[PDB]
Symmetry: C7
Subunit: 229 residues, 7 copies
């Protein structure tokens, strides 16, 4: 915009006139010590006010040098909400496309103090879940675990080079949970979901094939009758 050009011209004019008066003040402007003090105060205020912008620019330069992410991939941070697919990497501001298709303008300085996670560069997608048996299938926990583990071992979509754990490890207050923890070969978010659904259906079939069943949030009641007779 032409008005933006006008604003830049005004800013550079103010800066350059300040520089000239400070640099050539001693020649004409008396009290070089007074000019020293005034310029020091002004510069200190300006810098301690614009430190945010300067940090943004320097963080942008750093991001450009070392690349925690590229345009295509999507990022997230446990410390702060910046999740989304990066659209543009600017000097001061980076635009990220959220998963609801909304722009998100992240100052670059934010990346100098938080740990940035890059799921776009991940190698595998993880499937984690719990079974949660019924406290009366305790005699069947071992066979259920073995069957689930064998099913996961022969699943085409499961990566056999990664960790594949199926173990009764929780012992919750209303169920005997069995952790299932594996990885898929694909990282597409549609093949992964299909594989997860298939694994879950196979798990249901395995659990119900034996005499076991999943548990609801059970209770005991100790019912008492106090209604008038």
């Amino acid at each position: 915009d032409i008005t933006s050009a006008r604003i830049m011209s005004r800013i550079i004019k103010i800066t350059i006139i300040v520089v000239l008066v400070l640099l050539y003040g001693e020649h004409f402007g008396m009290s070089l010590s007074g000019l020293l003090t005034f310029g020091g105060i002004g510069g200190l205020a300006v810098g301690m006010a614009g430190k945010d912008i300067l940090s943004n620019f320097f963080s942008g330069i750093m991001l450009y040098f070392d690349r925690p992410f590229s345009i295509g991939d999507w990022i997230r941070s446990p410390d702060r909400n910046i999740e989304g697919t990066v659209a543009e990497i600017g000097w001061r501001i980076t635009k990220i496309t959220t998963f609801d298709n909304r722009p998100l303008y992240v100052p670059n300085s934010l990346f100098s103090s938080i740990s940035v996670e890059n799921p776009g560069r991940m190698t595998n997608r993880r499937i984690t879940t719990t079974i949660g048996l019924r406290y009366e299938d305790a005699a069947k926990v071992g066979v259920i675990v073995e069957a689930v583990r064998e099913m996961l071992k022969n699943h085409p979509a499961i990566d056999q080079r990664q960790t594949l754990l199926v173990y009764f490890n929780q012992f919750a207050d209303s169920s005997l949970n069995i952790m299932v923890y594996c990885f898929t070969k694909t990282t597409v978010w549609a093949e992964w979901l299909a594989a997860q659904q298939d694994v879950y259906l196979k798990i249901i079939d395995i659990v119900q094939s034996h005499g076991a069943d999943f548990a609801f949030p059970s209770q005991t009641l100790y019912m008492d009758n106090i209604t008038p007779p």
Copy 2:
């Protein structure tokens, strides 16, 4: 107001007199070192007190240069509550109209340290939901998922170029949740709500038609009946 102009003139006169005494102090005011100390202390205090206003002004300039938002679109921030429609962008503060029609005055400096989202520039509005089947019907999960996916694919208000996912991926503590995740073509908040309602009614029809039902928060009770005989 007259008093506002009076206050501005008083501030200007104070600035002028301090500038004059600092610049011409050496000529008449002795103690060049003492004048240095006094002026430096005063300037440091003033600047370290007004850094907030200076930051507001600089952030306003930056907002003018980089344009996260216009004067018509609505914005929000995950970090802080600034949600609303931008009413006007000032040099020091931005006036935003909240969705309950209340003015909100946001200092510009906060825009230099938070990530600003701009839903006003969004491309599509997303419909996300969960089914949560009655959990005693797991043999009907696949057919229900397929029917819902086909219904969404054939829906005229759903954008077919965006992600369209319908998958069982949960094992909820009381239900078999099926995530549904799609996008609409419109972004008007009135056609989007109508499309969402239509999709939800279609989903209800699909679920009921397949001999399934939505789940409530179930539990088991193990009745004891300790009432006195």
Copy 3:
């Protein structure tokens, strides 16, 4: 309070003597460097201690120039608890009358770093609610929605130029919720409450006129009697 004056005079005298010794002590007081460093340290410590007090005054000046609120208006902030109707705006601290009829003295500095919302300046009061049908009456949602909408279209206390939405958009845990979102023409907190009550009663009448009903929080019990035979 003669002491108010005594302490002010004492502070003025201390400041004056410090200024005299720092400014006219260059010749009588030897060690220009020593007095320079002494005065610098003292002034720096005083400034770092009084930065908050100076910030209060500067923020008061800014509030006087830029006016987020006036005496009559009642304000609030998402970031801090300053809710109430402002009683007066001092240079250093503003006192606000809370809705308990209690005075609350808020320093001006806080207004330089928080978003100040001014509900006193609003144009409309918003009515928002949800219906939450039993989920056994999903066939009556649509009709009911329309009915409610029509009622809000004909209500004399509802502003027709503002947002007016009535839609099923939830799939709640135990009910089918219908968001109602409208604005009233008045902003007086007494006609608004009366209009809200009238709208709610009309909504009850509309819901019960059909075969629908509002839902309680339900769960499926599944009892397995284990009392001794």
Copy 4:
């Protein structure tokens, strides 16, 4: 502790001798630059370390100048827990008598950055509550409201010049809550509680006069049986 009085004397002696050496160092001590930098570093360390005391003293002076509270009245802050009755106001700390009859020593600096509320200076006490009818009483809500309102218009202990609101505005999860919001004309904490109790008893009587019968959580049990034959 005579030794600590000697320690105080030693502290003041150290301060005075350091000042004298800094001011008389040049005459005997040499390397004006070295002495200057040593004094500067020492002063910077002392100022950065011993700043809380100066801030507390300045905040105490300010508290004396502008009086957010006096000795008798009790104060509270939404930001920090300082609730209690002011026992005495010192230069660095204030003693506040909590409602446990325990002394609480609040540094003065805290008062320079938090909003201080003075309930001791309030003009009225507020009675606020909700009714919460059964949800089978909708047809009787209106009259109920009116009745309650009338009971508050004729109550000797209710201030008629303040806001007096009685309205159905909630649509709660298990009840039809009616907000009651009024003010008493006493502020002594014993007649206020008595008036509140009287108003609550009158509200109970009014509600029972009609078939209203304040509600309970009221969940639907959606019962099923799986006990083996």
Copy 5:
């Protein structure tokens, strides 16, 4: 420990050699400006690093001069967890014996920025509780309140000069709570507990003397029978 003395001697040697080189550098070395900047940077870094340690000592001096707590009384802070009995007060570290007989070493600096409560110096112990009647005995509230108030007024362990409030002021969701708020004469934690137990037993007797038994978390079931025919 001899090595502690060795470390102290090493620190003293480093300090003295630094002082000698910086203060007599010009007479022996050269580069007044270079030595000045080097010494300044070094001293500034050391001060920024040791500000916390210096603050500890300054806060210890203040804690001696102003005495929030003595050598035997127990303290606590709503801001920080420092609860316990003061074991000893050092120049930098204060040792407090927690109530589980475990030492706690708190830096003195913390006491300069938090409000310290000293229940060791309190005058009375407070008894506060709620009754919570069955909510079907509202006609008994007045007589029960009067009886409890008379019992408290006639109790020999209750301080009659302090506040003594017994009032129905709640409208809980499942009961009619009655606040009881009084003080005891003793403050020794063993007779206070005995008096509290006696008051509680007397309250139980008073409540059950009238047909106004206490309240449990009531509910309203609304059963739907869905068992297969």
Copy 6:
């Protein structure tokens, strides 16, 4: 690898060359004033960057002088998670052994701003618990309290010189809780647990000896039947 000593030597060489150029710039380096500000800015940046590292070493020195803990002691802090058994105390980093036998490397600076508790030096271990009767055995509260108190007083593993409290002081939501609060003579975590188990079993025996019987959550229901006829 050699890279450690190589990097140390490189850092030493860089520091030495910087010192030489800055301190001999006076002789050959032109613009004696320019190099002064260059070195000043460089040193300010380096110190402001390494303040944390310097503070770590200073806090290590302080920890070596003042001894909150020794090698064998296991420590914990309410402010931050550092719980574990000290493994070694370094100059910058302290190595702690967690109770899950994992190393934990705590920067020494952490200990300069948090209160460190040292359970390793406890004198006694504490047993605290509550009984929780049923509201129907309120007539037995006194007798049970006396019996438990006598049992604790006669127990051989309980320290009689410490506080020994057994009192009804709660009025729980669904029970009459009796607080029990005593100390054991041992502090070894194995005899303490055995003594606690023995005390708990004796408490169960005492409670069952009378008809108290250890209340449950114990709510009320008020059944309403809406089942279709």
Copy 7:
């Protein structure tokens, strides 16, 4: 993209010409005081902006000297979420592989202010669990505890040199909890899980061998009837 090298060379040129002009300005650029002011302002602003980047590099150097972790080791921090396996330690950024196989980029400065835990250097894995007996079978707690202790003492996968605790210590609101606390010899996350599953199954067998079942979330329901006849 050679533009990266071009921008790096531009930065080098800027930072070298600044040094050239500042160090040679005194020869040709007048106003030594003004030039010093400008240079100091620029350096101070750049330092405040790049302190974070400088701290990252210094923390990287220290992390190389002191080694909290190595490449293969997997680390975590109670303060920040940095959990994962270290991929590579850089000068400014450390790359860590999370357990969901995605990279995480942690600035080195984070390691200078948080305590880093290294379960990679862990020696033994811990098995900790709770039993929670039926809470009406307290007479069997001792026998169950002894049996479980013997089972753990005779288990070949349990380290007998570590702590091995099995004790009743809780009085849960619905159960009598037995804490079990032991260590396993292996640390491979696969034999540990197998050993934990075996121990849990043996615990179930022991608990059910002599009649004592696990507790559910019990209640005392107190049914009351208010349905119309």
